[PDB]
Every structure is written in structure tokens, then in C-alpha cells.
Symmetry: C2
Amino acid sequence: SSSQFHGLAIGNGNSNYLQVLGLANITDTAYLTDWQDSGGNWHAGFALPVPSDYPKGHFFQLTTGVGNSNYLQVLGAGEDGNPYLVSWQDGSGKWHGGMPLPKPSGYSGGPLVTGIGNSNYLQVIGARVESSPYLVAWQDNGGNWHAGMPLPNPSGYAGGFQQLATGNGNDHFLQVVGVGNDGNAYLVTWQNAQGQWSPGFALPKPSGYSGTFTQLATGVGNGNFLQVLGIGTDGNAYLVAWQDNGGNWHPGFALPKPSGYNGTFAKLVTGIGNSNYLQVFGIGSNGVAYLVSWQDSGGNWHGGLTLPQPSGYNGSFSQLAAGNGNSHYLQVVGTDAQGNVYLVSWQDSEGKWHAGFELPRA
Amino acid sequence: SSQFHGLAIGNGNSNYLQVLGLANITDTAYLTDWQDSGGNWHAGFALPVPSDYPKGHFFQLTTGVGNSNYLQVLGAGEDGNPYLVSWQDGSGKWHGGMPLPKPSGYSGGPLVTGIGNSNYLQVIGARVESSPYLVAWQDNGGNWHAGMPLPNPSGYAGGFQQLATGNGNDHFLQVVGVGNDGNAYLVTWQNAQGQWSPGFALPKPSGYSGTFTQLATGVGNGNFLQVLGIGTDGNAYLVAWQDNGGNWHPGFALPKPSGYNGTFAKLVTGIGNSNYLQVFGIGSNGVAYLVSWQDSGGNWHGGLTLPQPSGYNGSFSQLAAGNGNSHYLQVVGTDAQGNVYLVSWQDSEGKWHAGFELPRAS
């Protein structure tokens, strides 16, 4: 067993129990690091069962997706250059070895991103775009996987993308946003309820900022309004743009920073907090794990705070990830400097944050 | 990009120290920074990629010294192929590389190099799922040749989490490994004809019969080859060392920095003042340490906290070490965001000095 990780991914499994996935340091072996029960108790995991067609397989990136019958799917970028379903988890919590994804012609191995598409069909998309965007594969509601295809570039641009991210927009339509190789923020493409993909366009720039971005992340905001957050090349955190319930996009603005903090951010992730208030987390230029900002139910943004340090560790985290656990309490997990997985902090129904702890070793 | 992971270090033209790394999010291979003979640091740029993989990306990098003392940057392609990403000539110019010829059965993964018979550069699979592999070797005229499977240690064949290389004064190339069993092995060595032989379990360190998560080699007193390890107990060990007759001897737990009671991970070695072997690692408190250092009588000494660099009081997620101007040992690292810092540098007298953030790659 390995106990130190990188490349965490987080999702909900059987009975919505939170599952923290990871790549072992040195070996890049896919693991369940830990999982949390309905009492909030954390349990050590174990190496995930790998595909019979990649039987000693290793991955340089992982991500999760909710599949058929809400079976948690763990997707991985093979170190053999192929995309995989590493493993899936059934409704009893048992994990099963996966399979290679039915990828399209012209797809070149890289990191994956998932989204929930039409009829809830899980979509697995290439998260970096060297030429045209690709849907690697999609999964029907009986669990069957289907061959991918190219996806549309946005209006006016075919320069490739550093990063694609996904979120659900108006009428549940999947939106795929990306940071171009030109540093601009795009809606790359969006998918309607019948599964058809349309070209996107440049997202409106945030208030007062004409510059470029290095990273995007999405979050479900007030009124179910999709929010696209970003890190500027300036080092600041932004709401780049948000989408209304009619599908139209509106400009964002620089996020309000935690009181007293004058540094930069990177490694931005979102979470759904108390009263479903959207939370935005990030890592400071001082190494500190922060709630950058949170958004109330009216859409108003509020400066964040230093996340209350977990017991016995006053160091920095190299990655943060978030999800909802027992009673819907928001959990922020991360990897310390060695790669030990911590609950950095958890948040109660009132919005108050509580110090976490180093989770049990896989 | 200016935030990185997966740093590698080597010495290039005029022995100028070179810091290589992988851009965060995109996994693009970069020279992050280099240092001149006066000690001054300089921003890097994206490496030129192989014309057979012209928008390529990599999940791991390493370096070796090639024909004509040309620095070679090897990379594990996200397409599943091992590559020479780029090579540098004696003027400092970088050249796009090529896919390595590879043997049947080699499965894409991280690479490690070593210098073999006839100083031919050897690129070896750093993780072993079946048999150890020589991926490729380079001849004295710079041409690459496909490798072959290499021996296993006597009657262990369970694969290896990690391989490392080093040489004794007898020159023979030694390949050490942590088995999937957690045990340390001499996996194989290459004799004076370039032929490889089965190895054996290394001597275990006095006072610890448990398993290991990582090894690293270092050249110590009298150029004696030392195998360092991180125990599954989280402690740092000299696992074993090799004498001038090529016999192996058991080591012992390293003398820890006085006062320090936590664990270490992410161990790397460096050659310090007076060629004294230095061992570095990252604590469970998130702090970067010199774990121990060894004098010319071969005696080990407790280490210290590396002096925190200017402008950052957080943790580093990776340390890498190399000799720069006037041989001064440089310890570089990635902060929590991925910004590359000189963590600390050591003067001629063995005294460590606070570093600073490096120039950002363009």
C-alpha cells in the first residue's frame, strides 16, 4: 500500500458517500485514498482495480463522473497513451475494473474532463486541445460506452486550449469552457437536450480586466446560474462570466479577496456550501489554503478566509478538492507537502468552518 | 506558463545548471530557469518538442549526459511513448528530440537514466510492471538503439515501484529498486562487457527490517555508492552502501536534524561543500530539510532546517538539487502554487543561505 498522493479527484459514490481518489506518488497507481460514511467517519481505501486490458496500468491524471444508475466512474489518462475508465463503483460500494474508452481518430492522449450531458449521459472530454476538441466517449443510461467524435471549436478561434472545464447551464445544458492557447476565456461548445453540440464563442471579459487567464473552474451559483471562475495571468481570482436561466452570458468581476490578504491565487476549485452557497477555494502565494470568496443566495459575493488549519499541520497544501459529505457538509481535502491526504477543513450548516485532520492511510 | 511540477535538474553548456519542469495544467515541457557561472539566474522557456510529436506533452521528465557532453531531456509522452524531448548543444541551444526506439513489451512510464559501459547513455523504465527494461541506449556518435529486457534480482520477480541508478569506482552501472514487495534490491548491474546480471536483495539497515517507499543513490566518501531510502515507517535510512570491492554493506537510520521528530518523504541527494554527500527531504510539518550530511571519514551528521527563501514562508512540494556556480549546491523547489524557488543555496564552507523566487519562464 501507498499512502502519499498527487492528482486528487473527488466524487460521490454508493449512498452518496464521498470518495477521494488519487495517484500514488512515484508509481502513479490509481487509488481510493479514503471514503466517508454517513456519520462523517473517514475510512482508508486501497488501489483501484484496473482494466483487464491494462492489467498493471498506471495513470497520469484521474477524474470522476456520475454514470448510469448513479455508479461512480473513475476516468484516467493512461501512461500507455490511452484513455480509460479505470474503475467503476456499484451501489454496494464495490469497485470493478474498467475498460479502455472508445476514443475517436485524431485524439492524442491527455488529461480528461467529464460532464453530465443530455439525458444525464456521462460525457468524457479531452481536457487539453492541441487541434480540435474531442469527445473521447459517452455513456448511456444502461452503462454502455459509445465512441467519441470531434467537437466544435468556438466561433472564430481554432488555436487550441490549455484547459477545458464543464458545468451545467440553462435547462441543464452541458457547457464546455476553456482557456485558449491565446489566454482568452471561451465557451468552447455547448450541448442541447437531444445531444447536439453547438459552437461557442468568447466569454465576456470580467469587469475592469482586459487580460488573459491561466485556469478556469465552474460552480453552480445563485438561482442555478452557472458561474465560470478563473485565475488571471495577473494572479487574481475572477468570476470571468456567468450564465442566466435563458442561456445568455454576462460579465463577471474580480472576486472579493479574504480580508487582509494581498497575494495571488492559483489552483482554484469550487464547492457547494451551506444553503448551497457557492464557495471558491484557492492556494495563496504564501502557500496558504483559502476560501477565496463565497456567494450568497442573492448572488452577492463576500471575501473569504484562511481555511482553519487541520490539526498538527501548519504547512501548505499543493492541491485542494471539495465535495459534499455526510449531512451535505462541505469538505475540503488536500495533499500536504509530502502528499498525505488531509481533510483540510469542513463546513457546518451555518457556514462556519472547522479544522480538519490527516485522513486514514490507504 | 510560470507554475510547474515534475522538476528535473541537469548541467548543460559550460556546466550551467538547468532546471526543467512540467507546466501545471498543460504538462508542457519547460526549461524553467538556468544559472550562469557567476551565480545569476535566468528565465527559461518551452522546450522544443520532437518533430514526430509536434504539439507533445509529458507526464515525467528526467535528464542524462549524452554524446559530446550534450544534455539530454527525456520525457514520458502522454501518447504512451518514451521520448528524447530535446537536447542541448555546447553553445546552449536546444534542439527538438525524437521518439526513443523501444523494446517489445515496454509500457509507457517514467524514465531513469544511467551511464553504462563505454559511457553509453542508458534510458531505463523507472517503474517495472513485468521485467525491467532498457528502453534505449545512445552510442558515442549520438545515435539511439532499442533496448531489451533486463534481469530481475535472484528469485524475486514481483515488479518494482521505482528504479534508480548509480555507479561504484569500478564503474559498473548499478540499478537498485524498491520492489512491489516494499523491499530494496540490487535489481541488476552491467559488467565490463556491457552484459547485465541478476541482482539480489540489498542488506537491510541495522535497526530496521521493514519496507521502503522510495530509494535514491548518492556518491559519498571515497566516491562510495550509497543507497538512501524512505521507510514505510516514514524515516530516512542509509539502506546499504557499496565498497570498492563491489560488496554491499548494511546501513542504518540517518541522524535526524536535532529536535525534529516527524517523518520524511520526497528524498533527494546532492553533493555539497567538500563533496560531502547531502540528503534532503520534506517533513510531515511541511518543512524542507537537509536530513543529514556525510563527512570525508564517511561519518553521518544530523541536518537542519533549510533557510526559508525570501518572500515565501510556506511549504515546497518537491525539492531538486544540483551544483551550480563554483560547485555551490542549489536546492530548488516548487511552492504550493508551483512557482519555482531557489529554496536555499550552500556556500563553500557548508553554510546554507536563504533563496528566492526564480525568474519566471516566458
